[PDB]
Design a protein around this ligand. Structure first.
Ligand SMILES: CCO/N=C1/C[C@@H]([C@H](C)C[C@@H]2CC[C@@H](O)[C@H](OC)C2)OC(=O)[C@@H]2CCCCN2C(=O)C(=O)[C@]2(O)O[C@@H](CC[C@H]2C)C[C@H](OC)/C(C)=C/C=C/C=C/[C@@H](C)C[C@@H](C)C(=O)[C@H](OC)[C@H](O)/C(C)=C/[C@H]1C
Length: 108
């Protein structure tokens, strides 16, 4: 409900990120039925982060944790699992549902 994870291409079905593990991903984020606000693909540089230890929005952490290595997935994140009633001023409006197209490339 807070985050829906829908497969674009399956992963290995077996290797999922552990809390504290470094995840290497490509992503594109857009406002649902609106504008693209960020893409690591457009920078040709994958995004690395430590799941849990480097805190992200709830739907990102819980959505990526549900993915296995190699998986590409559409994450639809409700505002309560994203930036909420305040949004992220200047970038994400109040009460925004977010879509991320995420590909889990590697776990380090
Ligand atoms: C994963 C963890 O990494 N996330 C990050 C940002 C995250 C969100 C802003 C964080 C707050 C934390 C507090 C909670 O209260 C807030 O709740 C409302 C959420 O962003 C996201 O969660 C999502 C999902 C991942 C891709 C980016 N993202 C977006 O929405 C965007 O696409 C956006 O364009 O990203 C961009 C921002 C705007 C979004 C719409 C991302 C931004 O660019 C230039 C980048 C890459 C910034 C990097 C900062 C690094 C700083 C370090 C010193 C330390 C760092 C590792 C930490 O440890 C921090 O702690 C102490 C914290 O951990 C941070 C800042 C992690 C970064 C890597």
């Amino acid at each position: 409900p807070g985050v829906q994870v829908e497969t674009i291409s399956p992963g290995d079905g077996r290797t999922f990120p552990k809390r504290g593990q470094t995840c290497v991903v490509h992503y594109t984020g857009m406002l649902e039925d609106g504008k693209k606000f960020d893409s690591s693909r457009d920078r040709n540089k994958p995004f690395k982060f430590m799941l849990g230890k480097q805190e992200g929005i709830r739907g990102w952490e819980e959505g990526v944790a549900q993915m296995s290595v190699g998986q590409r997935a559409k994450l639809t994140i409700s505002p309560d699992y994203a930036y909420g009633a305040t949004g992220h001023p200047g970038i994400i409006p109040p009460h925004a549902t977010l879509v991320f197209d995420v590909e889990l490339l590697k776990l380090e």
